RNA sequence: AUUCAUAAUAACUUUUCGAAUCGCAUGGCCUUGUGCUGGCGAUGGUUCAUUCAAAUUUCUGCCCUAUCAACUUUCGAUGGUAGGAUAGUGGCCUACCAUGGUUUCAACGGGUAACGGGGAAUAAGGGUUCGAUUCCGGAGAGGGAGCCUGAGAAACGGCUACC
RNA sequence: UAUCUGGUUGAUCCUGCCAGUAGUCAUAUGCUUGUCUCAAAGAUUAAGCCAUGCAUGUCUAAGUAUAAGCAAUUUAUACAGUGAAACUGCGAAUGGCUCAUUAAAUCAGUUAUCGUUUAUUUGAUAGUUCCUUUACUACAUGGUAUAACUGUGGUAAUUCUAGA
């Protein structure tokens, strides 16, 4: 009653005030790091409940027409490339990319597929990116070896130059 | 159009905004002051750059009349003044007609109301409608 | 908040209010020069105080001191420009001896009186305030102008005033209608 | 204040920016950058107040947003990038080039340098260190880090950059009889020609400098920027060559050579 | 000026990082394959320097009051050694001697119709009074206390609790 | 603008106050709806209490949009436009206000950090990562609780919330 939701793990039949956080149910922090103290009901069911939420996991011999005769159609299909691959699972070279899940929705007299933007798909641009980052790395390391080698050559010239000056001194 | 003797001073070439920057001073004896629909096209013909690529403002009348000084500027094209000229001047000169908009008090109040709503809000109207019966 | 706008006073009230010798002189001064207030004298004496204070401090410094060589010359040029002290001096002398009569002698109220376009200090003051005067090309209505000695030859009647053509004046314009109304 | 300030009131901005008291109550706070807060010129106050290329900060942002201005060769598409002393900035419209330099009276003057002059910049080495892997480096006055410097260069020297790479093309040591610039103190903008440096073991080395007019003065070592040897400076000097005319003779020169 | 920078050597690390990210551009030698390479950039997470900052001291300086002459009293109270904590110094806190530290050059108490300063008013010269308040610094968010997140807050148009 | 003057006596000279006098970015108040510019303004008593409404939000060519959102395909059958939300990121520690506390404490001259830095900016900088290890072998590139969104919800009520 009064709307307070039950919470898993409290292990009590009474309402309880708890300091809730992000990644804790019954509370959505409007601000990062914010904690609020809210009243929640314990997970134990008693006479005081107004509504109990139940999932059916094993149907009996009987049937309920509103649930079994109706099957909610697909609302969103898989988006990630590998997620689509395990959704069908036929093969890898069987070009499922251009056979991706398309859903028919029309706002007027014209129809469109509106396929999801497939993610983690290998693109020539993605091959371009990894290729360039490899090239940029080798160009970086090679150049720092030239600058390091050139400086050692400069240091060798300086040491000999200082050695040459003291060669004149002391006969 | 009689002895208006409009002229510009301190003309500097500002190509980063692609315009000519200057101050404009007019001598208008036996005249109150020259208006925009007069000064803008007069500044256009003297410069021969474009027609609506001219802008003037400031224009304080000298104490006791006689002459007036302000600021002016001319663009290379009308399609180039559209990208730089301030909006309020464009609307004032007639280059744009601003649609009516909600007041600051009302705009801020609406933002306060929809910040009170999480989600898009389509489902909230249904729950209230379904719970309005009892 | 925005930086404060500085302001400063321009006049100073005398220490002893009811001085017969000072009261008589100041009201005598106002009559000879057509001033409306004693504050119009107080400011000139306040302006003179800042000047005598400036020269006194400068003159305590020794000769060929860079401070008075620069600041004394600047004060001379400003005072010569406004015509309060005589221009045929180069000795930093007149400054400490400047009298009150010298400053308001250079005011436009008396400047246009002795230039012949006003015929009285009170007529000039009304003439000044009603904008029938241009110093350069510009109409002024300030009784206390401090003409800079380059404008005494530049004085003239305002072109936007009667006696300038195409402008008889509002009372004259009414009589213009009376001229036609008299016959009708 | 619980954290860094992000605003800058007027009357609290550095005086040499030549900002007025009124027409606003916030001066453009220079963001973090190569130059310090006080000794830097924001691009906003340069492009607007110095040249009048713009009337306000919105229109400078319009100038900035199209990548027309670039300091040290890099665009800097932000309102308050702190361009500082000896920085080169470029306006590719008609090829206008600028070197942020100090005038006689201690303010950032407006230069006009050529393309071959705008290629190079002069950097005073703030400290000499070696970093990770024994690699030596020098920190310039504008925060640049240059690896593998010439071993002959020490602190208080002046290296010249090419602004197309990060390397040192040439440098000049710090010693008596070298042309120097004053960056800070009350002698700001004066060109010095070092005559002596007295040490004071433990802090604030002092240097004595006399310009072309045989006027000598003393300033802290951290305020001295060497800019060349006798004769030719490494950079183009501003109008007036930093000679510090007195008010009396500045009054005369203003009267005759208007 | 250093046990500094930075090497190098045993090792230790419960994986820190060491780009599976994004946009525009598709130029070109080829035995036609993204196969050889591609150009500008955006956002990088590490480290060093830099900048914007923060924390930390007293070198000297503060109004009236003796109708305040002694004060600092397991449990800090001056110093030592060691540890813990901290971003870090430090009685900052925890484990001992010595009575250590301050004081008529005014300590310590009491008062302040006391936030400090740049400054203001008033002036012969010296002064007297003021400064809540346009700038700078400090503190606070009704009173206390505690804390999350975050580079940074003991934040209050963030949280928690009591009054 | 380095002034003084009145009041003790029958009269005098003093000491000495009282009173006058001038100023006040010192405040209040008395006497007023006809002028230009400029401008302080709930500090003093109550750092007292607050109805109400505003005062922090935020997007690019470039982190995520199949909004069942609005829109001429042949450059948009993988998406490539605009785009409400929601996530992620950043910011909300700035700003603004006030002066209660506070008497070597704040503060001021900004000594020192050889006593501690890295929203950020700027510059530089990582060929060492088959850690069941001389390919006994994905980087032409291993997944998932959950937000949005669809769905009969609960509560008088909140910017309350798992239930597919």
Which helices and strands appear, and what pairs or packs with what?
This is part of a larger assembly, with chains A (171 residues), B (134 residues), C (184 residues) and D (258 residues).
Chain A: E1 15-20, E2 36-41, H1 65-68, H2 81-88, H3 124-168
Chain B: E1 7-14, E2 19-27, H1 36-47, E3 54-61, E4 67-75, H2 78-81, H3 87-93, H4 104-115, H5 122-131
Antiparallel strand pairs in B: 1-2, 2-4, 3-4
Chain C: H1 20-33, H2 39-60, H3 66-82, H4 94-97, H5 100-105, H6 108-114, H7 121-129, H8 170-183
Helix pairs in contact in C: 2-3, 6-7
Chain A binds two RNA strands through strand 2, helix 2 and helix 3.
Describe the structure.
The structure is cut from a larger assembly and holds chains A (171 residues), B (134 residues), C (184 residues) and D (258 residues). Helices cover 33% and strands 7% of the residues of chain A. Chain A is built from three helices and two strands; from the N terminus they run E-E-H-H-H. The N and C termini of chain A lie far apart (108 Å). Chain B is of the alpha+beta class. Chain B has one domain (1-134). In chain B, 34% of the residues lie in helices and 25% in strands. Chain B has helices at 36-47, 78-81, 87-93, 104-115, 122-131; strands at residues 7-14, 19-27, 54-61, 67-75. Chain B has a four-stranded antiparallel sheet with strand order 1-2-4-3. The termini of chain B are far apart. Chain C is 51% helix and 0% strand. The relative contact order of chain C is 0.10. In chain C, helix 2 runs antiparallel to helix 3 (66-82) and helix 6 (108-114) crosses helix 7 (121-129). Chain D is built from four helices and 17 strands. Chain D starts with 40 loop residues before the first strand and ends with a helix. In chain D, the strands form six sheets. Chain D has a five-stranded antiparallel sheet, with no helix packed on it. Chain D has three domains: 1-116, no CATH class; 121-171, no CATH class; 174-244, no CATH class. Chains in contact: A-D, B-C, B-D, C-D. The B-D interface holds B 12-17, 21, 71, 84, 86 and D 52-55, 58-59, 62-63, 66, 68-69, 91, 93-94. Chain A binds two RNA strands through strand 2, helix 2 and helix 3. The PDB classes it as ribosome. Keywords: 80S ribosome, ribosome. Pre-frameshift complex of yeast 80S ribosome with eRF1 and mRNA of WNV. Chain A is Small ribosomal subunit protein eS6A.
Task: Summarize this structure briefly.
This is part of a larger assembly, with chains A (171 residues), B (134 residues), C (184 residues) and D (258 residues). Chain A is built from 3 helices and 2 strands, in the order E-E-H-H-H.
